[PDB]
Design a protein around this ligand. Structure first.
Ligand SMILES: Nc1ncnc2c1ncn2[C@@H]1O[C@H](COP(=O)(O)OP(=O)(O)NP(=O)(O)O)[C@@H](O)[C@H]1O
Ligand SMILES: N=C(N)SCc1ccc(Cl)cc1
Ligand SMILES: [Mg+2]
Length: 318
């Protein structure tokens, strides 16, 4: 049995693929500190967001394709590696870490050292868009242009790939987080109601959509003037309005990617289509929106949230 693992350190979720097993951990990238000291990591910690008492704090070491808090991140990483380490397993843990293309050497050097103090002896790195493409099952080894769009929590990465390499690759600070922000702003600018990020993220999943039809839900927030709990009903349409901008910035980046794609490679993409991954790819109607604005066929990968991890794992086994 092996202790070799691949890690996808996301702003929102962290996944770990273990050689021989598969994906063996899937927990939010949240750490809870009590007055500091590591109190809870992952699933527990996330449930505390916007609900912590005065002597506690719920943190996301990564926010927007970066590591805003390095020390808390190191603990998170260490905890997850610790949590999945198999004492009956071999040593010399080989560790592949997924990393964005907009990744500074500062962020890399830290990621690396963090694994070494966690028990890693060797540490390899792999590009997120590559890991995503592989996980989604694209023929990134063949002589054909394959375009992948990994919409995550803090960033979206659009990349064209072929011959085991990257033809084009760009990262934009837009994703789920900003999609949540947009909903929070909409509720504030149109219903004078303040809502939390948890409530926002739930609205996104329950009625969020890139395009209006309709369907509706009840939002539990607070009225700004009299500062007391109130709830307003919101519709699929209203939801689309809130999300128009962040959705638009995704579509744009997808176009910019194409304009920068040589004619031959661009055709291969129009044949099979564009592949969306990441949790942001689960936003209803997003694939359809991109499809319309680009004219190209769009397909949502299977288990979008796991593509990067599964792509990293495939490499770990070869
Ligand atoms: N059904 C859904 N509809 C809309 N958004 C969703 C849905 N499910 C998950 N998300 C969002 O997907 C985002 C995280 O997806 P994820 O692919 O895990 O990104 P990440 O890898 O964790 N972080 P990063 O890649 O660095 O941007 C979160 O913002 C979620 O809110
Ligand atoms: N998974 C992503 N592409 S965003 C978070 C991140 C992960 C690693 C490093 Cl070094 C920086 C930011
Ligand atoms: Mg990601």
């Amino acid at each position: 049995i092996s202790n070799d693992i691949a890690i996808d350190l996301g702003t929102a979720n962290t996944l770990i693929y273990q050689k021989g097993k598969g994906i063996v951990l899937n927990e939010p990238s949240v750490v809870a500190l009590r007055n500091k000291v590591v109190h809870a990591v992952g699933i527990e910690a996330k449930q505390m967001l916007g609900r912590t008492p005065g002597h506690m704090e719920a943190i996301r070491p990564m926010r927007d394709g970066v590591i805003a808090d390095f020390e808390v991140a190191e603990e998170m990483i260490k905890y997850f590696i610790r949590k999945v380490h198999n004492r009956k397993g071999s040593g010399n843990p080989k560790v592949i870490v997924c990393v964005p293309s907009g990744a500074t050497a500062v962020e890399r050097r830290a990621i690396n050292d963090s694994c070494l103090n966690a028990g890693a002896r060797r540490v390899g790195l792999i590009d997120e868009p590559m890991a995503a493409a592989i996980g989604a099952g694209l023929p990134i080894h063949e002589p054909t242009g394959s375009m992948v769009v990994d919409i995550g929590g803090g960033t979206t990465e659009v990349a064209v790939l072929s011959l085991s390499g990257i033809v084009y690759s760009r990262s934009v600070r837009v994703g789920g987080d900003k999609m949540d922000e947009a909903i929070i702003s909409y509720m504030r600018r149109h219903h004078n109601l303040l809502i939390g990020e948890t409530t926002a993220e739930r609205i996104k999943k329950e009625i969020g959509t890139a395009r209006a039809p309709g369907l509706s839900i009840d939002v539990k927030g607070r009225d700004l003037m009299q500062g007391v709990p109130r709830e307003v009903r919101i519709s699929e349409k209203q939801a689309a309005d809130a999300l128009a901008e962040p959705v638009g910035q995704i579509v744009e980046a997808v176009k910019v990617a194409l304009e920068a794609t040589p004619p031959e490679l661009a055709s291969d993409i129009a044949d099979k289509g564009i592949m969306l991954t990441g949790g942001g790819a689960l936003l209803r109607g997003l694939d359809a929106e991109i499809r319309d604005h680009t004219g190209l066929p769009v397909t949502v990968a299977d288990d979008p949230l796991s593509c990067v991890a599964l792509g990293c794992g495939k490499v770990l086994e070869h």
